[PDB]
Write a protein that binds this ligand. Structure first.
Ligand code: HEM
Ligand code: HEM
Ligand code: AP6
Ligand code: AP6
Ligand code: CAC
Ligand code: CAC
Ligand code: ZN
Lengths: 414, 416
C-alpha cells in the first residue's frame, strides 16, 4: 500500500502516506510504467460547453473547502459548515460555484506545493496572488499581465507571482493566453525548413504574424502576446520594452563569449497551464518565479531542438569536436551554464544554480514529510539536465502522484 | 489512434507505439494512483527464496511460453519439433517437478534476458554474447575455475568480450549455487576507527564477510577482494583471484599531469555476479555476466558518488576551484576532468570502454532496431540517461516505456 521511500546516499527511509489522498490517475499501471512521458493521452482538460456533473464537482469542492478551513485551523467551525452550504447551494442551483479571494490564494499556493515537476517548491508559501477574475476583455488581460510582469521582475529582485483570470464556464469559450510563456523569442522558419531564433516557438511566431504582427529577423526578438477573451479571436499586444528585462550573456574569463550576442530574459512565466482548485478550472493563470541556471544554460541554449549552440562554443574554445570521447560537449555546456550564472549575478537578476536548488528541494522534502507525510515528485524532472548524480536529488527515491489543487496541461486553443 | 502507449522523441518529433509491452506477464511497482518508477528496488520482481518446489502449473505456463519464444526465434512455431519439445517439458515437470534446457535454448534465453534488461544501455550488443555452459559444475572449487576462465576470456587482454557463465539451476530439496560478491571484481571497504571507510564504502559488508571467513585484510584504497563461492548445502569457500587475471587501469589525465599522482585506478572488467537469471521459470541463482564499462560508471558514480570514493572535492582543490560556493560549478568542472581521465586512461591502456555519448547514441539505434523487430523496447529512463550531461545525450529526449519481460535478470536476496 504505502510505498517505502529510500535515499541511497544517506540510507534514510520514509513511508509516503500522502499519496493515499490522490484521487486522480496517472499514466502508469502494474503492467508498464510511462513515468518518463511528458504529456498524458487525455488527462488534459476537455472542453467546457456543458456543466460538469454536480455530484463530482460537489465532492471536489467540499474536499477543497475542507482543506482550506483545515489550513486556518477553523475546521468544524460554523464558518466551515456555512461555506459548505453556500457551495452546495450554488452548485445545485447553477451547476457551479465561485471561490472567496482567500480560498483562491490558498488554492494557488497549494497547487504549486503539489506540482511534482517543480524543484523550487521550498518557496511555495511565498506567492503574490493577483485576483484578475473581474476581467472581461483581452485588453484588460493585457493590463493585468503588464502589472504582473512589472511586479514580478522588480528591477531584478524577482518575486514569485500568479495572476488568475476568470474560471471556465459551461457553454462559453475560455479566457486563454496563447503564448506558452509571457516572454518568448520568435522562431522564424525559413525556406529549407530550418529556423532562426527559438525553434520551440515556430508555431506561436507564425500565429502572431497571421494575426497582424510585423516580424523581425533576429534570434532574440521578443514576441507579442495573443490574448483571447471568450468566444472571440485572440488579440495581439506588444509587450513594452521597458517591462521585458533581458540579461546579455558573457563569460567571466572567456572574453570572446560575449561576442556571441547571446542573451535571455529574466522572467520565467508559464502561461499555458490550467489551474484547478476544488473542481473549478482557470484556463488562464500565468505564474512566475525565477530561473534555475540549467533551464537557460543547458536546455534553452544547448538542446538540439532549441538554440543548439554547443558546437559554436566548443569551436570557440578550440575543443576537439572530432570525437565524442574528448567530452567537448560536456566542457562547452559547463562554461555556458557558468556564463549564465555570471551574467545574471552581474546584472543583479535573481537566479539559482542547480546545486543550491536541489539542496533546498531536499530540505523541502524533509519539511513535507513532517507536514503531510510525503511529497509528490517527478524524479526525471527534478534531477537537473547536467551533473545529475552530482546533486542530492539523484540519490533520492521519489513517489509521483496527482494531488489537487493542481496545475495541469491543457489543449492549445487553436 | 492505436490502443498502445504512444511514445515520443521530442528532439526529432517522431512517434512510435509500444506494442511489445502487451507481452509482459509480470507486474511492476506502479499503479494508476502513483508512479514508483524511480525506486531502485521495488518489491515485485524481487526473486525472494521460494524453497518448496513451485506450482507445477505455474512453472509449466512459464515453461511453455519460453519454449514458444524459442521456436519462434528459429522460425519453427507450431512445427513438429516444437510440439514435441512442449510435450517433453511437461513430461519432465510431470514426474520430476522441474525440467532442463537444451544447450541452444540456454544460449537463446541468456541473450534474451540481456535484451530484456530495462536498465542496460549497452543492449545494441545483445546479439554478441559468449554463453559458457557450466551446468555440470559440482563444487565451489570448480566454480572458481569456471569464473577464472570467464575472466580470462572476457578480459582478452583489454579487448573485452561480453560473456556469461551459467551454473546449475535451483533444484528442489537442494541448496543454491551462489556467488556472494556483487561483482567478480570489487575493492575492499575497511570500516575505520573514526567511523569512516578506507577503500570502497559500497563493499563494506562483503569485505567484513570475507574477513569473517578467513581472509586476511589489507589496508589500501584499492585492494581486490577474494570471491566467496558457494556450492549447494556447503558453507561458502574463499578464493583469491590471481593478480595477473585482474586487469586494472591506472588513471591519469591527458593534460593535468598531477592527476596520475592521485594514485587512482579501476579494474577493466564489469562483471555482475549476484543477479538471478530466470528462463522459462527455471532459476539460475549463479550466472555471472560481463561486458565493458561506459565511462560515467567509473568516473561519475564510482569515483564521485558521495557514498563511494567521493573524490570530487579533492580533485576540485587540485584544480584550484572555489569549492566554497555552488555557483562556481566546481563539482561540474571536476567531474568532467575525472570522466575525461577515465576515458584517456583506458584508451592509453588499450582497454575497451565507451563514453556516455557514444553509448547513448548506439542505444538509440538499438531502439530503432527493436521497434521494428519486436514493436518496442522496455527501458528505464532514470537508468538509461547518464549521471552527467543528461540532456546533452539523445536518450534524455526519448520517452520510454518500462515493463518486465522474461527471460530476465532479476535481483535476489543476499545468501547471508
Ligand atoms: C521560486 C522559483 C522557482 C524556481 C527556481 C522553480 C524551478 C522550476 C524548474 C527548474 C522547473 C522545470 C522547468 C522546465 O524544465 O521547463 C519548474 C517547473 C514547474 N514549476 Fe517551478 N520554480 C519556481 C517557482 C514556481 C512558481 C511560482 C510556480 C507556481 C505558482 C511554479 C510552478 C511550476 C510548475 C507547475 C512546473 C511544471 C511546468 C511544466 O510542466 O512545464 N514554479 N520549476
Ligand atoms: C557490452 C557492454 C555493455 C555496456 C556498455 C553496458 C552498460 C550498462 C550500464 C551503464 C548499466 C548501468 C550500470 C549501473 O548504473 O549500475 C548496465 C546495467 C545492466 N546491464 Fe548492461 N551493459 C553491457 C553489457 C551487459 C551484458 C553482457 C549483460 C548481460 C548479459 C548486461 C546486463 C545488464 C543488466 C541486467 C543491468 C542492470 C543491473 C542492475 O539493475 O543493477 N549488460 N549495463
Ligand atoms: N526539468 C525538466 N524539464 C523537461 N522538459 C524534462 C525533464 N526535466 N526530464 C525529462 C525530459 C524528457 C524529455 C523528452 C522525453 C522524456 C523525458 N523533459
Ligand atoms: N545507471 C544508473 N545507475 C544507478 N545506480 C541509478 C540510475 N541509473 N538512475 C537512478 C539512480 C537512483 C538512485 C537512488 C534513488 C533513486 C534513483 N540509480
Ligand atoms: C570565439 As568565436 C570563434
Ligand atoms: C594536485 As593535488 C593539489
Ligand atoms: Zn511509473
Amino acid at each position: 500500500k504505502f510505498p517505502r521511500v529510500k535515499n541511497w546516499e544517506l540510507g534514510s527511509i520514509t513511508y509516503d502516506t500522502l499519496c493515499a489522498q490522490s484521487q486522480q490517475d496517472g499514466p502508469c499501471t502494474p503492467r508498464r510504467c510511462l513515468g518518463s512521458l511528458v504529456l498524458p493521452r487525455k488527462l488534459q482538460t476537455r472542453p467546457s460547453p456543458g456543466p460538469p456533473p454536480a455530484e463530482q464537482l460537489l465532492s471536489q469542492a467540499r474536499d477543497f473547502i475542507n482543506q482550506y478551513y483545515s489550513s486556518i485551523k477553523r475546521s468544524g467551525s460554523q464558518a466551515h459548515e456555512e461555506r459548505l452550504q453556500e457551495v452546495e447551494a450554488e452548485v445545485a442551483s447553477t451547476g457551479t460555484y465561485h471561490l472567496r479571494e482567500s480560498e483562491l490564494v490558498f488554492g494557488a499556493k497549494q497547487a504549486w506545493r503539489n506540482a511534482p515537476r517543480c524543484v523550487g517548491r521550498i518557496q511555495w508559501g511565498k506567492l503574490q496572488v493577483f485576483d484578475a477574475r473581474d476581467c472581461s476583455s483581452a485588453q484588460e488581460m493585457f493590463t493585468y499581465i503588464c502589472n504582473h510582469i512589472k511586479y514580478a521582475t522588480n528591477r531584478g529582485n524577482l518575486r514569485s507571482a500568479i495572476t488568475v483570470f476568470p474560471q471556465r464556464a459551461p457553454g462559453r469559450g475560455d479566457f486563454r493566453i496563447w503564448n506558452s510563456q509571457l516572454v518568448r523569442y520568435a522562431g522564424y522558419r525559413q525556406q529549407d525548413g530550418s529556423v532562426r531564433g527559438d525553434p520551440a516557438n515556430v508555431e506561436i511566431t507564425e500565429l502572431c504574424i497571421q494575426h497582424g504582427w510585423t516580424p523581425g529577423n533576429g534570434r532574440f526578438d521578443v514576441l507579442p502576446l495573443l490574448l483571447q477573451a471568450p468566444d472571440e479571436a485572440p488579440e495581439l499586444f506588444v509587450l513594452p520594452p521597458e517591462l521585458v528585462l533581458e540579461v546579455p550573456l558573457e563569460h567571466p574569463t572567456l572574453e570572446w563569449f560575449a561576442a556571441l550576442g547571446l542573451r535571455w530574459y529574466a522572467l520565467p512565466a508559464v502561461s499555458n497551464m490550467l489551474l484547478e482548485i476544488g473542481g473549478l478550472e482557470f484556463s488562464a493563470a500565468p505564474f512566475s518565479g525565477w530561473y534555475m541556471s540549467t533551464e537557460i544554460g543547458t536546455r534553452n541554449l544547448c538542446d538540439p531542438h532549441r538554440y543548439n549552440i554547443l558546437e559554436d562554443v566548443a569551436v570557440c574554445m578550440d575543443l576537439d569536436t572530432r570525437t565524442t570521447s574528448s567530452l567537448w560537449k560536456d566542457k562547452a555546456a559547463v562554461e555556458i551554464n557558468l556564463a549564465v550564472l555570471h551574467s545574471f549575478q552581474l546584472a543583479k537578476v535573481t537566479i539559482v544554480d542547480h546545486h543550491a536548488a536541489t539542496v533546498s528541494f531536499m530540505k523541502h522534502l524533509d519539511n513535507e514529510q513532517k507536514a503531510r507525510g510525503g511529497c509528490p515528485a517527478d524524479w526525471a524532472w527534478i534531477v537537473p539536465p547536467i551533473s545529475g548524480s552530482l546533486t542530492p536529488v539523484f540519490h533520492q527515491e521519489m513517489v509521483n502522484y496527482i494531488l489537487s489543487p493542481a496545475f495541469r496541461y491543457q489543449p492549445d486553443p487553436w
